[PDB]
Amino acid sequence: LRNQSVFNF
Amino acid sequence: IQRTPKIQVYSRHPAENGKSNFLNCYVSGFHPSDIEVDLLKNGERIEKVEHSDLSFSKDWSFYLLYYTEFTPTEKDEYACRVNHVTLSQPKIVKWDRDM
Amino acid sequence: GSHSMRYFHTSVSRPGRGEPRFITVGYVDDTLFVRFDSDAASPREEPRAPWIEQEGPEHWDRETQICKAKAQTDREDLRTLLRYYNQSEAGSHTLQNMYGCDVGPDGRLLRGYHQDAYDGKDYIALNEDLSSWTAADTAAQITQRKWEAARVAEQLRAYLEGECVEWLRRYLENGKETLQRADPPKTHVTHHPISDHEATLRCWALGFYPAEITLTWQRDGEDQTQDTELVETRPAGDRTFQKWAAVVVPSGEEQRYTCHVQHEGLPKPLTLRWEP
């Protein structure tokens, strides 16, 4: 199951 | 900074003349990921060639498996032809049933 | 034994040839179970193992949604990195991410991972504590500052210690027939004369799973590390792996050499010799 969290550099 | 592919040409099962098998060309340890891989039968490109989905090792270098169903014989010569940005010319590695 | 779940992601820009290609794969140990490719006809998280096919349509939609959102953030991150490294918009660049967890035989978390690379070099990585970062350079230090302000590590830690371990446990039970089966190597030694005075002894290991194996040659009981040619472990294409180790032996001295094989599928390490 993938991590749903989104983060940008 | 770029890494040249390591190349291995081999069969799925030990080779027996007249028995169906799979011919594999494993390319690994390379960067960037764009790469051209051909499987050859008597110096000519084999048409039905599938490959694995792009993945990478702990050191970030890429690897791919290229493969085809084949029936080895005494006469028929098989090889793998690879091109990559680190190679000035396509590298050809012959299939040796003892490797 | 011990197990892992990992997701791998690769974005490759191709200026003048459309948007970056995004490819992501998921593995449990050495078994691929999901894939997503932005260049596919209808991009979706596709099952690649029979034990994951049982997951419902709401699960496939969730995973597909995450893959599409990750391809988009990667496209934004590739633009960001052009700025941080003062590069032109003309070249092709690569962004890679891996994250996942390792569990012991009891299913308890051994450790978690989350790490990124740019153009094949480390960029930023979540430390083993799941609370601090290691930035490779002054460009990654900008991302570190943004991630420390946003408490990204806390979010990652919650996923790695929670869902990552729980779903890995779920997959291991649903796939117990294959995932919890170790196939020992099929082993043999071949002899290949090089000249009148020496020959090659090649020790083979075939049909094994998982990929982890140790193959070594000894001479009079002494490890031949420097003189052993050891090929990288390679996939056979039927889930199993292969490997060989070779040594150049002087004619008549073949019985001084012994091949040692360690594998999870073996209760005890094996010793082999060239028979004829």
Side-chain angles (χ1 to χ4, degrees), chain C residues 159-262:
Chain C
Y159 162 84
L160 297 169
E161 288 202 294
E163 282 178 337
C164 192
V165 296
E166 289 315 307
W167 285 73
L168 173 52
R169 288 178 194 165
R170 178 199 183 103
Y171 298 157
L172 288 167
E173 175 60 28
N174 296 339
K176 62 186 185 197
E177 169 189 296
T178 48
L179 294 177
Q180 292 184 245
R181 185 186 81 238
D183 302 319
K186 297 166 190 184
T187 66
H188 72 281
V189 175
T190 64
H191 188 260
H192 312 286
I194 297 160
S195 70
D196 271 6
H197 53 283
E198 60 195 13
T200 300
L201 289 184
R202 188 163 284 115
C203 187
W204 292 81
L206 299 166
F208 57 96
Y209 182 95
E212 173 60 32
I213 200 166
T214 304
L215 259 184
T216 56
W217 277 110
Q218 275 174 23
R219 181 210 191 264
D220 306 339
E222 168 184 47
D223 298 326
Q224 298 302 99
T225 314
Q226 274 306 135
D227 287 303
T228 295
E229 191 197 339
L230 197 75
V231 297
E232 180 176 14
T233 302
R234 65 202 193 188
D238 57 5
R239 100 188 273 260
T240 76
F241 297 85
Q242 309 177 356
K243 199 188 193 64
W244 59 248
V247 284
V248 175
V249 312
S251 307
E253 299 193 13
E254 294 86 357
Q255 290 312 309
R256 290 175 85 167
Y257 294 81
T258 56
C259 178
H260 299 84
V261 187
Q262 293 202 276

Side-chain angles (χ1 to χ4, degrees), chain B residues 36-64:
Chain B
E36 192 175 308
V37 177
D38 300 317
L39 295 185
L40 312 178
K41 177 177 179 178
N42 302 129
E44 297 304 322
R45 178 173 197 242
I46 297 168
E47 285 180 13
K48 153 242 186 290
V49 181
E50 278 177 279
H51 66 84
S52 61
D53 304 285
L54 188 66
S55 192
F56 53 85
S57 295
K58 289 160 76 174
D59 69 359
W60 308 109
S61 67
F62 295 97
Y63 62 89
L64 285 171

Side-chain angles (χ1 to χ4, degrees), chain C residues 63-276:
Chain C
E63 299 315 78
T64 292
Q65 198 159 221
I66 292 170
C67 287
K68 289 184 186 190
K70 171 69 172 162
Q72 183 49 51
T73 61
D74 266 19
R75 289 173 182 187
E76 300 161 359
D77 285 352
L78 277 163
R79 283 194 286 271
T80 296
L81 289 197
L82 292 182
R83 302 200 309 275
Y84 289 4
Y85 289 109
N86 314 118
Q87 301 167 321
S88 57
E89 279 147 51
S92 170
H93 294 278
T94 305
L95 238 334
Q96 290 163 270
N97 176 80
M98 179 271 281
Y99 70 81
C101 55
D102 293 346
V103 296
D106 55 4
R108 294 189 297 104
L109 175 73
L110 290 169
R111 75 156 286 174
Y113 308 83
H114 184 284
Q115 47 206 58
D116 289 279
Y118 181 55
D119 289 332
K121 313 204 319 268
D122 302 331
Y123 183 63
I124 199 178
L126 183 63
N127 292 327
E128 186 169 10
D129 62 12
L130 314 181
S131 62
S132 72
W133 301 98
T134 295
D137 57 37
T138 60
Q141 285 170 23
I142 306 305
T143 295
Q144 182 168 351
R145 295 210 283 275
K146 284 171 90 169
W147 287 3
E148 284 168 340
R151 296 219 178 255
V152 165
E154 290 86 339
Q155 299 169 59
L156 289 171
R157 172 185 174 183
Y159 162 84
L160 297 169
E161 288 202 294
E163 282 178 337
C164 192
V165 296
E166 289 315 307
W167 285 73
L168 173 52
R169 288 178 194 165
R170 178 199 183 103
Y171 298 157
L172 288 167
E173 175 60 28
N174 296 339
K176 62 186 185 197
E177 169 189 296
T178 48
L179 294 177
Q180 292 184 245
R181 185 186 81 238
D183 302 319
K186 297 166 190 184
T187 66
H188 72 281
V189 175
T190 64
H191 188 260
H192 312 286
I194 297 160
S195 70
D196 271 6
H197 53 283
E198 60 195 13
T200 300
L201 289 184
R202 188 163 284 115
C203 187
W204 292 81
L206 299 166
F208 57 96
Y209 182 95
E212 173 60 32
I213 200 166
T214 304
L215 259 184
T216 56
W217 277 110
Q218 275 174 23
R219 181 210 191 264
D220 306 339
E222 168 184 47
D223 298 326
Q224 298 302 99
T225 314
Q226 274 306 135
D227 287 303
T228 295
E229 191 197 339
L230 197 75
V231 297
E232 180 176 14
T233 302
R234 65 202 193 188
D238 57 5
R239 100 188 273 260
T240 76
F241 297 85
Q242 309 177 356
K243 199 188 193 64
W244 59 248
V247 284
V248 175
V249 312
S251 307
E253 299 193 13
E254 294 86 357
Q255 290 312 309
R256 290 175 85 167
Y257 294 81
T258 56
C259 178
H260 299 84
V261 187
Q262 293 202 276
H263 191 267
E264 173 183 340
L266 307 164
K268 291 277 167 69
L270 305 161
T271 305
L272 293 95
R273 282 164 212 90
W274 157 238
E275 272 144 46

Side-chain angles (χ1 to χ4, degrees), chain B residues 1 3 6 8 10-14 24 26 28 31 33-34 53-56 59-60 62-63 65 98-99, chain C residues 8-10 12 25 27 35 96-97 115-117 120 122 192 202 204 231-232 234-237 242 244:
Chain B
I1 294 302
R3 292 168 271 185
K6 293 173 191 269
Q8 291 191 257
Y10 56 100
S11 52
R12 174 178 306 175
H13 308 294
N24 291 330
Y26 181 61
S28 62
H31 228 289
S33 57
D34 286 338
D53 304 285
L54 188 66
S55 192
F56 53 85
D59 69 359
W60 308 109
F62 295 97
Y63 62 89
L65 182 65
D98 300 322
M99 275 174 72
Chain C
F8 300 92
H9 322 74
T10 305
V12 186
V25 289
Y27 283 82
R35 64 88 82 172
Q96 290 163 270
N97 176 80
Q115 47 206 58
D116 289 279
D122 302 331
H192 312 286
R202 188 163 284 115
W204 292 81
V231 297
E232 180 176 14
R234 65 202 193 188
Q242 309 177 356
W244 59 248

